[PDB]
Amino acid sequence: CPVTLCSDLESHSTEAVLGDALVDFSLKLYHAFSAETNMAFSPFSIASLLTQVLLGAGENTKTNLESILSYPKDFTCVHQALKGFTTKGVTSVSQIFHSPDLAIRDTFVNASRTLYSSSPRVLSNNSDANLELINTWVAKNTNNKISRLLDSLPSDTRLVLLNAIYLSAKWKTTFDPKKTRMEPFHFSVIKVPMMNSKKYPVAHFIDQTLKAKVGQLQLSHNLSLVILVPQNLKHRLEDMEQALSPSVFKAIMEKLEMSKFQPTLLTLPRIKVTTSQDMLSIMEKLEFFDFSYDLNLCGLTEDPDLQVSAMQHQTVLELTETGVEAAAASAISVARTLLVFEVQQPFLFMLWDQQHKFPVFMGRVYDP
Numbered sequence: 001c002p003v004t005l006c007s008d009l010e011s012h013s014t015e016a017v018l019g020d021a022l023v024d025f026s027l028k029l030y031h032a033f034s035a036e037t038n039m040a041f042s043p044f045s046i047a048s049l050l051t052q053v054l055l056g057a058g059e060n061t062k063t064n065l066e067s068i069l070s071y072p073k074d075f076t077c078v079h080q081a082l083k084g085f086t087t088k089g090v091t092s093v094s095q096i097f098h099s100p101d102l103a104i105r106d107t108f109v110n111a112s113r114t115l116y117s118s119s120p121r122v123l124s125n126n127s128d129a130n131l132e133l134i135n136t137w138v139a140k141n142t143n144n145k146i147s148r149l150l151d152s153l154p155s156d157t158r159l160v161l162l163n164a165i166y167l168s169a170k171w172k173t174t175f176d177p178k179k180t181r182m183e184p185f186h187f188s189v190i191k192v193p194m195m196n197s198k199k200y201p202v203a204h205f206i207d208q209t210l211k212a213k214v215g216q217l218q219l220s221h222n223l224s225l226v227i228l229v230p231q232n233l234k235h236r237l238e239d240m241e242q243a244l245s246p247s248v249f250k251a252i253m254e255k256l257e258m259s260k261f262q263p264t265l266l267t268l269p270r271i272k273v274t275t276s277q278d279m280l281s282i283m284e285k286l287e288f289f290d291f292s293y294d295l296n297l298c299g300l301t302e303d304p305d306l307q308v309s310a311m312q313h314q315t316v317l318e319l320t321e322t323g324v325e326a327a328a329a330s331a332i333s334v335a336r337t338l339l340v341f342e343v344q345q346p347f348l349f350m351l352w353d354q355q356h357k358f359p360v361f362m363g364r365v366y367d368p
């Protein structure tokens with residue numbers, strides 16, 4: 001162990017590599033997560049937290065983490081590339097808290113100020129105080145959509161790494177809320193909230209490989225909502241998903257990106273989804289032997305008694321008539337699992353960054 005080597009960043013190419021890696025990472029996470037219900041998560045927040053862990057990792061841990069994230073061997077410019085994947089529709093901030101008995105290397109301190117515009121903050125002796133500090137930080141950076149990321153903060157806690165994302169954007173064409181209706185849905189039968197518009201601009205086509213309608217609704221700030229729905233009842237969402245390889249996914253997004261928007265009768269489920277998940281436990285389905293038992297964060301601190309055992313992830317995502325709001329946070333911390341969802345007809349969706357070409361949020365609606 002000796003950090004700090006990216007001085008020259010060729011922005012087209014490191015951008016392409018990183019977007020591609022986040023795509024791959026997104027699909028791996030999606031697939032591990034779908035192994036049957038309704039959820040949303042932010043592969044980008046999760047990648048961002050793990051890349052912060054990576055900034056302070058030693059050799060063996062770097063290796064595992066890079067493979068999980070599909071980053072190439074060499075990619076020292078990742079952190080600078082990742083820093084400029086923030087948009088005006090999407091915010092991303094990162095922060096560390098530590099006990100005063102955990103010394104953070106100066107080198108880690110410098111890198112953290114450069115990349116995150118933040119310095120490590122000190123925890124106090126009080127468990128409840130620390131919890132409010134942290135949870136308030138997250139709230140502050142998710143427009144209060146995530147007001148309680150952590151349930152508790154054990155007394156033995158010496159390190160918290162966090163990331164928080166806030167995405168907010170308007171539809172180019174809004175829906176009319178007098179046309180929004182609670183519509184029957186077959187499922188004890190229920191009613192579900194449905195935004196309707198007879199001539200909405202959707203770019204869409206059927207892909208013969210997924211056997212699926214592919215559609216995109218345009219938002220401001222180069223973000224879109226991308227939807228994949230099985231093309232009819234003969235095909236289940238699981239088959240579509242398993243066909244969704246990285247090459248298939250990328251070929252869809254390419255064709256999608258040249259497709260014209262055209263007036264389309266649209267009955268958009270008015271999705272509100274809140275998901276909390278131990279994402280380490282999902283992450284961990286992507287490697288055989290668990291990296292955490294040899295956790296080497298010598299980049300971050302000389303202290304050897306640091307242990308990573310969970311990662312809280314929470315996503316809140318809301319479609320309205322005016323736009324989308326999606327918040328996510330991820331922490332290396334104690335985690336709880338709760339999936340809150342409104343049942344609907346099956347599809348996958350993404351909030352896609354059409355500038356940097358990766359999924360900021362991904363989600364699934366399933367009809368059991």
Ligand SMILES: *[C@@H]1O[C@H](CO)[C@@H](O)[C@H](O)[C@H]1NC(C)=O
Pocket residue numbers: 106107110
């Ligand atoms: C970190 O940055 C400070 C400047 O504020 C500098 O004095 C110090 O040399 C740097 N630490 C190391 C060892 O990289």
